[PDB]
Homo-oligomer: A and B are copies of this chain.
Amino acid sequence: ANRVATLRRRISELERELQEAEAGHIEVLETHQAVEHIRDVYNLASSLRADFRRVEDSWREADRALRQSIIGEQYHRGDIVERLLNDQDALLNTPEGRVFDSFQQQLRQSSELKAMSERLRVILSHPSASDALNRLQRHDLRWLVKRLVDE
């Protein structure tokens, strides 16, 4: 009931915005606020790239721990046969691996990524963006999807 009520209020709000738009009450952001919004969206986007280098370290640490445990257990086969029969990856580093895997599941919805890539270029084509972000930042934000997928 709460879900349907919230969606019913949201759809009515969108209808009101549509009614205003039909009347011609469009108001785009000035430069003063467009610069701020562009900077904010840049500061959010650039964080997606932050933790790729730590997932690798966590997985390597799990690998070293697993090998040391295997060597230490001089007389136990049950643990290794348990590991091998499991269909899951041997390096279940819960704190980082699972979050990264769920993030990858999102990265593979190419429909959203294409729209995001187009929107990046369109935003960077606006006159205000040249003042909001210097050259290097504009370049970095322009190639975000490519480097995300490559990493």
Contacts and interface: CB of A to CB of B under 8 A. Distances in A.
Q: How many copies does the complex hold?
A: 3
Q: How large is the interface on A (under 10, 10 to 19, 20 to 34, 35 or more residues)?
A: 10 to 19
B14 A11 contact: yes
Chain A interface, DSSP helix/strand/loop, else mixed: helix
9 contacts: A4-B18, A7-B14, A7-B17, A10-B14, A11-B11, A11-B15, A11-B18, A32-B98, A32-B102
Given A4-B21, A7-B14, A14-B14, 16 more contacts: A3-B21, A3-B26, A4-B18, A4-B22, A7-B17, A7-B18, A7-B21, A8-B18, A10-B14, A11-B11, A11-B14, A11-B18, A32-B98, A32-B102, A33-B102, A36-B99
